[PDB]
Assembly symmetry: D2
Homo-oligomer: 243 residues x 4
């Protein structure tokens, strides 16, 4: 029982790898740092039950993953852009940076998904879980480029599911905010930066950051297919900040 998780060392990657492995999955992992063999060896040694791909092209991850087993049960498309690039404004941002936002958050997941459909269909189905953002559904003033690129991939889920669900290929979008994770809300920020707390207690009904095991629980629940009729929609993971 196999899962592919992209950008494994960032965003929702750590929560997904830990939860899927604890659930009995062999978790095949992609990451930019894995072009270095030393990084692959360290990740695998330090993460029992994982395989660290060398492959870096989005349209080649799936075939690479199939080197390690006969079928993929779950793909976690864990796409991200580092801070502070997610807060790039419109004015003054370079064309290169505009393109890079869409490349990482919109084009990469599409090329991945495209490459997955035929093997996933042939194996009788699978789950594809796209990790997006709260701004995939609800805008924020300081994410005017990031937001559009995230909204594209949420729309991708909603449209693609209309055809892929009949093949047993079940697509979902998760939109986090105030989620304890190394990319946007690392534990070091929570404990050292008094500004984060104060706004969580004001803006987040739950009153705290979402925990890694709570993101893991959502991912393994979707991955179980036990509630497949919720296929094809966006889930806020924001502690009640959305809607």
């Amino acid at each position: 029982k196999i899962a592919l998780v992209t950008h494994a060392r960032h965003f929702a990657g750590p929560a997904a790898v830990e939860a899927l492995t604890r659930d009995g999955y062999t978790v095949v992992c992609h990451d930019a740092s894995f072009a270095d063999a030393a990084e692959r060896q360290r990740f695998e040694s330090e993460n029992p039950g994982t395989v660290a791909l060398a492959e870096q092209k989005p349209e080649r991850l799936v075939d690479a993953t199939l080197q390690h087993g006969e079928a993929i049960d779950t793909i976690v498309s864990n796409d991200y852009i580092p801070r502070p690039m997610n807060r790039l404004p419109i004015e003054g941002t370079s064309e290169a940076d505009i393109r890079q936002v869409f490349e990482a958050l919109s084009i990469f997941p599409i090329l991945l998904l495209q490459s997955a459909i035929a093997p996933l269909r042939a194996a009788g189905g699978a789950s594809v879980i796209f990790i997006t953002s709260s701004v995939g559904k609800k805008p924020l003033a300081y994410n005017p480029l990031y937001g559009p690129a995230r909204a594209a991939t949420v729309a991708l889920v909603e449209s693609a599911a209309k055809t892929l669900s009949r093949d047993g290929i079940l697509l979902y979008a998760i939109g986090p905010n105030f989620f304890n994770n190394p990319t946007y809300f690392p534990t070091s920020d929570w404990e050292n930066n008094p500004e984060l707390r104060e706004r969580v207690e004001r803006d987040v009904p739950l009153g705290r950051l979402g925990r890694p095991d709570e993101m893991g629980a959502l991912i393994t629940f979707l991955a179980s297919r036990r509630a497949a009729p919720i296929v094809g929609q966006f889930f806020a993971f924001t502690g009640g900040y959305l809607p």
Copy 2:
């Protein structure tokens, strides 16, 4: 054992919830209109080992009646429904009494239930309150112009009340079913007997089939577990991809 309260237990999502929570280790305390009769209460408790059939019919009294059977309520499934074909009542020609009954059953009844539940649920340190609504709580349909508004009010109640209740650990959710195999709207016999339903599902449901009772059950017990608490306060389509 965890205590759950399920309203209208014989209808809509009731049977799926009562079965899933019972198999998940809960004592399921159940409300139903038919339980005004002591005999139906006995037969229900007989056919569903573990459950308790409440006599109380008023929404504001269900929580206290449930608390006669345990120390704290872990989960409330507010499984509101109105007898068919009232969900399809049009605007023209419908009596004032029917309009009011639509809002009474689908909007006022759950508000009075939730109102009565806040204080005891806060004192016990939280709970899950899951409202069974409808796909038309989020996306309108031509033939539900009164039922839709009433469902949308209760989805909005979830979205708004969760802004304050989540801090108490009282976690609210709405489920919006369609094409869900259930005794009210899509009984198994309709799937078995009517070729038009199969055709319509093939056309309109990406998943290609009705949602199963145990799939609704799995969503409800996943929510009741609180393991993914940060998804609190939103609406979940349960439609096989028909929504959005």
Copy 3:
């Protein structure tokens, strides 16, 4: 004679509707609870040119009352409101009578009005029915957990009822205001007296200012013109960019 019906004319979006509709050449027939007093009707009619102040108070009877003054209704502005601070009524501690009054004024009253209007508006070859709701009809607010649901029901009424009434030429719309300069929620007095309001608007309203009466009027008369019919059946935020 080009006739508009505006409800609760003294409140909320009423004054803006009356003024812009009158400017645009409509005979504006107005309902308002104060008009049960004959002194108020005469006064309103002399402060407001060419307007007609209805004595009628029942929602189902406003259309027939209006059709005593002309042959057909071109536009209905269903300007439903409740007095502050009922919009901020919490769930806890609120009386059942108050809960019911919120739905009565904001959900039942527009339905009864709409139901009564379909047959005569259809006979006449169409019309516009514009519901003034609120931003919480689409986006929840922590302190509007009852007002919100009642408003969301009426937005859903527009969305669903439009699926059938649009073929009759009866075009339904919902406007959802916030930070709108009006005597009910954001009076020009409140702006000048509460620096915390001006600070909240600077922080949360992209426009940076309250919406003006003539801007609400411009939206109302544009919809009433039917010049852009294909936008029928949806919700329009009137919030200065606060929504979405």
Copy 4:
């Protein structure tokens, strides 16, 4: 008053050009055919009052427009791709084609908007109206690439308006479907296709295509700024098919 209308020969272009001209604007027009001088001359003589730009690059249209007047009052970002590219599926579609969908429908309007902010702000404000699609908000099975690109630009309007509205630069998105226009619903289609008239009868509450003058009325109403507080949102133009 000066308006810029892009892709003026397609989609909502002819409706925009006619309505704004009739409302007293000099309408400066972009179009890919205007690289041909003979096409510019034909267009200008056939559309009195308009100016056909030779410029083709999205980030240069604003400066090209301001050679013809002191300030831009309205920009109509009339983005489109030739049909049936709107119906491209995920499987089989080339990477170049995936990229062109986003280029025309997402990147082009961003590069245009970016270039416009400073001159529009210096002139005291303006209106920027993005013509998107109904799939910018609600998914369709046959638009799994077009949908995401449209959804990005809808999200661009919603997010960028949070900051540009303060400058008096008012952004809107219009999302048409079943709109009588030369690209997706030409009148010849209505006459030729009984399936279309049947689908419109079943799915469109208005029971008819939206007229060009009705799109024009919406554009000129928005361009007037008379109802500025509705800034920053998506308007369905679908005869009630949405929501």
